Amino acid sequence: IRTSELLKRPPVSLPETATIREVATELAKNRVGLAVLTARDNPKRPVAVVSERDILRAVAQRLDLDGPAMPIANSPITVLDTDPVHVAAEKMRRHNIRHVVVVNKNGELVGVLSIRDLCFERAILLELA
Amino acid sequence: IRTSELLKRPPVSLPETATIREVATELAKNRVGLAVLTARDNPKRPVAVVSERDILRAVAQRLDLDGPAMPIANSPITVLDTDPVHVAAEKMRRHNIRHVVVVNKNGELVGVLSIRDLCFERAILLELATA
Ligand SMILES: Nc1ncnc2c1ncn2[C@@H]1O[C@H](COP(=O)(O)O)[C@@H](O)[C@H]1O
Ligand SMILES: Nc1ncnc2c1ncn2[C@@H]1O[C@H](COP(=O)(O)O)[C@@H](O)[C@H]1O
Ligand SMILES: Nc1ncnc2c1ncn2[C@@H]1O[C@H](COP(=O)(O)O)[C@@H](O)[C@H]1O
Ligand SMILES: Nc1ncnc2c1ncn2[C@@H]1O[C@H](COP(=O)(O)O)[C@@H](O)[C@H]1O
Ligand SMILES: [Cs+]
Ligand SMILES: [Cs+]
Ligand SMILES: [Cs+]
Ligand SMILES: [Cs+]
Ligand SMILES: [Cs+]
Ligand SMILES: [Cs+]
Description:
Chain A is of the alpha/beta class. Chain A is built from five helices and six strands; from the N terminus they run E-H-E-E-H-E-H-E-E-H-H. The two termini of chain A are about 15 Å apart. The complex binds adenosine monophosphate (4 copies) and cesium ion (6 copies). The site of one cesium ion has 2 residues of chain B, from loops. One cesium ion binds next to loops of chain A. Chain A: Pfam families: CBS. Chain A: GO terms for molecular function: nucleotide binding.
């Protein structure tokens, strides 16, 4: 019923000072589509997100792939861990994103949810309609 | 509800001889996650697919992005244009992919369906639940 129950894994994240390639390596190594950029001082606070989609455009535009990742990162769209799952689903539909970052009431990184999680379960699909 | 009815765009494709960067440019230009690689002799026949996920690994492994795209591509997982939409959704789930290449009875490239198409419409979501 709620967001936290659909989380499969610990959050895949790097510090905000990470390079574009460093994010690319971390995404390939974990077989995920998005990486959360955490703050320097506080590794629990998500400051941005970087997707393979962002890296793809960096490749097409011929950016320095060893340059900083923050300039291609976006400000996180979030859902609470205590929120119902359909909120995460409609934010994805609304923002045309395939990920939502799950945080707690303190604003700390709990995990990341994917469109993959919501669509491939019959129990969820009937709720989201 | 059948795959051909959820098609809203002509297939984004390149010839199988395309480089990795040439695919990356095509993906960015069309704002899509996948590109279908078509045959040399017959551009209607899909021979492979390349996702931005594949390009991402190319970046991480420091491959020559001006090298050919075919070695980083995959054998196309297809669905018929006449097939019902739940079959396409079933293949995405089973094979852990977010795209399916829609072809016709002759095996020619009609279009490409995405997990984005199936999940962001209430009419479809309900039918995916009904089975
Ligand atoms: N940044 C992340 N941290 C932790 N788990 C993730 C992250 N991104 C995606 N996932 C999970 O890993 C699976 C595959 O990720 P994706 O290929 O990005 O959909 C999904 O079902 C998500 O639940
Ligand atoms: N939870 C999120 N918060 C902010 N931006 C996002 C989020 N998920 C995806 N994006 C952005 O949407 C684009 C592609 O996202 P995705 O569909 O997750 O690959 C990239 O430019 C991402 O930075
Ligand atoms: N290779 C392709 N050729 C034509 N249309 C596509 C292709 N890939 C995706 N689409 C469609 O265009 C949209 C692009 O989204 P996506 O590729 O999932 O980022 C999807 O909703 C599909 O309906
Ligand atoms: N229709 C398809 N047939 C074969 N492989 C695919 C298909 N769609 C995606 N893939 C592969 O699955 C991985 C993730 O693709 P995606 O998550 O759909 O961007 C990539 O390595 C793709 O090459
Ligand atoms: Cs940006
Ligand atoms: Cs609601
Ligand atoms: Cs929208
Ligand atoms: Cs977006
Ligand atoms: Cs149509
Ligand atoms: Cs491959």
